[PDB]
Amino acid sequence: EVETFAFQAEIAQLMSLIINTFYSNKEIFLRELISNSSDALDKIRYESLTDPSKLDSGKELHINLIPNKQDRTLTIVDTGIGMTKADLINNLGTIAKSGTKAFMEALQAGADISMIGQFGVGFYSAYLVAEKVTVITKHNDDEQYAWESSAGGSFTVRTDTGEPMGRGTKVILHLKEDQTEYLEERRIKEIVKKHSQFIGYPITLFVEK
Numbered sequence: 270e271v272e273t274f275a276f277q278a279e280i281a282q283l284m285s286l287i288i289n290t291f292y293s294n295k296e297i298f299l300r301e302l303i304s305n306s307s308d309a310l311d312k313i314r315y316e317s318l319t320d321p322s323k324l325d326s327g328k329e330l331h332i333n334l335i336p337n338k339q340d341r342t343l344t345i346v347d348t349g350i351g352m353t354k355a356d357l358i359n360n361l362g363t364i365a366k367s368g369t370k371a372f373m374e375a376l377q378a379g380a381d382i383s384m385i386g387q388f389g390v391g392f393y394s395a396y397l398v399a400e401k402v403t404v405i406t407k408h409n410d411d412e413q414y415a416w417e418s419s420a421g422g423s424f425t426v427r428t429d430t431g432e433p434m435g436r437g438t439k440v441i442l443h444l445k446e447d448q449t450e451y452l453e454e455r456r457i458k459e460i461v462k463k464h465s466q467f468i469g470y471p472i473t474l475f476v477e478k
């Protein structure tokens with residue numbers, strides 16, 4: 270049972286700008302997704318300070334980077350607070366309408382796409398490198414869901430029958446054909462070292478057979 274939703278017009282416009290603007294510095298997508306994971310991990314950590322049972326769904330707080338050259342996917346996994354179904358539908362837990370307005374007002378005044386995270390909509394930088402993004406998520410207060418979009422103005426949400434996650438979020442980037450450098454170990458290592466040196470959770474780069 271799959272539900273299909275239209276993006277709000279402002280979010281569709283954000284996504285088309287990310288997809289269509291000539292902009293070479295695409296590697297910032299990974300910094301933005303790792304920063305989102307760190308934010309989600311901070312949230313579950315904070316809740317656990319007054320209620321240890323919040324970690325009954327998993328005590329480890331970490332970020333895993335999983336490249337798969339056969340599937341042409343880069344997956345960013347975190348064990349943060351996750352998202353409810355309502356969060357997914359409401360722009361993946363962001364205030365994306367007001368964030369997009371500010372971001373586009375910053376671009377016309379000289380900002381560039383790399384500053385997207387200052388406007389709270391860094392998730393959508395995934396579309397710099399991915400033709401399709403799948404988000405699997407599990408929040409303590411809801412069931413496990415899969416969100417998916419290839420842009421084009423719509424996204425889907427369905428209950429996820431896949432491998433149970435416990436708690437957190439998995440962002441699966443189905444990479445564009447010309448963006449496979451982001452599956453190479455040395456390239457991912459370089460980006461993490463350059464942009465994510467002060468992320469306070471272990472980032473494990475998985476290797477492939």
Ligand SMILES: NC(=O)[C@]12CCC[C@H](CCC1)C2
Nearest residue numbers: 461462465466468470471472
């Ligand atoms: N959080 C981590 O695992 C890192 C992130 C930056 C690159 C490496 C150096 C120590 C911190 C690993």
